[PDB]
């Protein structure tokens, strides 16, 4: 069994440039930036598929 | 005339004080027993009691 990647998911090649440090609510969170929009997501929760 | 009402069998001053006390008891700042909680799976970013 290999689960299918669902419908809304955006493929992203991993690269170091993606994950980075950033200030986020008085903490130095390991922010991820999503290349389709360029938006930063410091928390692992709430990130786009 | 003293028998017309028991006045709950209290002194007149205990009544007059009882008044202000009822004013204390219903002050919002004292009302600090809280009712009901909401369970929800959320990050504690920038916590505030309120």
Rounded CA separation A8/A39 (Å): 17
Rounded CA separation A42/A35 (Å): 14
B46/A25 touch (CB, cutoff 8 Å), yes or no: yes
CB A32 within 8 A of CB A47: yes
Candidates B40, B42, B45: best to mutate against A (most CBs of A within 10 A) is: B45
Contacts of A16 (CB under 8 A, 6+ apart): none
DSSP for B27-49, please give it. -TTT--------------SS---
Resolution in A: 3.1
Rounded CA separation A10/A32 (Å): 14
A13: contact with B, CB 8 A cutoff: no
DSSP β-bridge partners for residue B24: none
CB A10 within 8 A of CB A34: yes
Please give the sequence-ordered ranges of beta strands (E in DSSP) within A1-49, or none if there are none.
32-33, 40-41
Candidates A41, A45, A46: best to mutate against B (most CBs of B within 10 A) is: A45
């Amino acid at each position: 069994f290999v689960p299918d990647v669902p419908e809304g998911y955006v493929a992203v090649q991993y690269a170091h440039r993606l994950f980075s440090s950033s200030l986020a609510n008085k903490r130095n969170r390991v922010t991820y930036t999503h290349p389709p929009t360029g938006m930063a997501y410091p928390s692992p929760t709430g990130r786009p598929h | 005339e003293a028998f017309r009402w028991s006045r709950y069998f209290l002194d007149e001053l205990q009544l007059r004080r009882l008044s202000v006390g009822l004013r204390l008891i219903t002050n919002p700042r004292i009302a600090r027993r809280f009712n009901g909680v909401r369970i929800m799976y959320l990050t504690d970013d920038d916590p505030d009691p309120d």
